[PDB]
């Protein structure tokens, strides 16, 4: 009985973040997160205004863009409300307490002004959701719990991965999903969101084990692929993206029947 | 045939960044990392002036700074070197590939430009580690792996611990210790580094277990202790820094005998 975005979107634990996201998700026929993997502010504004069209969500990693500036955040969101995606800082937090809520709200980057969605690593314990909620609820924002990871001898495998899924039932107000290679919860309210993903068999350099679009959302039931080196390294990144998104969005339609 | 700070220092296949410290804790009778968790660059520099004589390294969270610039690293340097300390940012590291190596190298921040220690999560397995040493080993930087935390329900326990311990072993070009609540290695090159330390029995609304200097340097076997709150909220941080300076100092020499 899986039920379409739309009317995941509507559900009545739903949170409000993932229920916006649902609905653009099915309106624009597109669940492809775009990994905006650039150094450079005029680079980042450019490939999310372009295909800002083909995504549901741009994932960002501010503490790589040489030229940063809040000012810059504000383009994005002016993209980002235009075209209809999220903003999704993969800042990949993993502390507790004040410093966390503060790494979240403060600094130069102020994440949490700009950011819908934002992760974070499960093994410090709960405590990592407590001190982002405090910020991130008022902000009305959510967070994505890492449940497994695509790198060559990852130790978020069975009793972690079951851990992650804990959490996030059990702080529902604020999680909102999981970064995972599969499905891990059977609670249609959550997302799934999968990295490590290209069309072609292969690997990288550095430890990653890479699954195309029909498997991760048509076998293993993720919702969402996300997407670096497949679009940033193409010469045509429009056309990448459209490849991506009709893949994803297919193997979406294929397993709803 | 526990050997000393000192003698450490000269170990075989000491990494020199933990021959440097070594080196400067036996000279000043420091094992205080202090953790200066201020909002502030003005607060930053009068702590890391006034307390550097009482501490072997400074833990920072620069993304928490409101007034972050490379002019600021560049004081906190000199003072590092005026003092003898080491800079340690806690960025908890937890990616891999070309990603962590720009968060390392790049952006806003540049860790590997003033950072002689970062840290990193073993979760995603070794990638992070050799991701980071691809900047960090041609700068002489080190890392410290986080095998246990302080923290409520912290996953950090077992073979995920022993995974650090390997981890850690495997790549001794780069890693040079440990965050953990006590020794975890037999092996006298590496560093323990310990948080949640306070001079009295108490907790956090957060989420942290805490113990005293003398229960994690003297019965737990770790090396340093790292103390932000018991220093930073006190009235006098001079003496409450000479207070942990002297529980810790007393602690190692009782162990030694």
């Known amino acids: 009985m899986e039920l379409s975005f739309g009317a995941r979107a509507e559900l009545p634990r739903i949170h409000p973040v993932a229920s916006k996201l649902l609905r653009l998700m099915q309106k624009k026929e597109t669940n492809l997160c775009l990994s905006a993997d650039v150094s450079l502010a005029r680079e980042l504004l450019q490939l999310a205004d372009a295909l800002g069209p083909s995504i549901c969500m741009l994932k960002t990693h501010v503490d790589i863009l040489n030229d940063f500036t809040l000012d810059?955040?504000?383009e994005l969101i002016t993209l980002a409300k235009c075209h209809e995606f999220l903003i999704f800082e993969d800042r990949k937090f993993a502390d507790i307490g004040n410093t966390v809520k503060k790494q979240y709200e403060g600094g130069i980057f102020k994440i949490a002004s700009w950011a819908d969605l934002v992760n974070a690593h499960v093994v410090p314990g709960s405590g990592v959701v407590k001190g982002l909620q405090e910020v991130g609820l008022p902000l009305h924002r959510?967070?994505?719990?890492?449940?497994?990871?695509?790198?060559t001898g990852s130790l978020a495998t069975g009793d972690y991965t079951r851990a992650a899924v804990r959490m996030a039932e059990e702080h529902s107000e604020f999680v909102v999903?999981?970064?995972?290679?599969?499905?891990?919860?059977?609670?249609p309210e959550f997302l799934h969101l999968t990295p490590g993903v290209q069309l072609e068999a292969g690997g990288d350099n550095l430890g990653q084990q890479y699954n195309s679009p029909q498997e991760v959302i048509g076998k293993r039931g993720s919702d969402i692929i996300i997407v670096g080196r497949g679009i940033i390294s193409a010469a045509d990144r429009l056309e990448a993206a459209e490849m991506y998104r009709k893949a994803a969005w297919e193997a979406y339609l294929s397993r709803l029947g």
């Open 72 to 74: 810059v955040m504000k």
């Open 142 to 151: 959510g967070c994505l719990l890492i449940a497994e990871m695509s790198s």
């Open 177 to 187: 999903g999981f970064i995972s290679g599969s499905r891990v919860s059977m609670k």
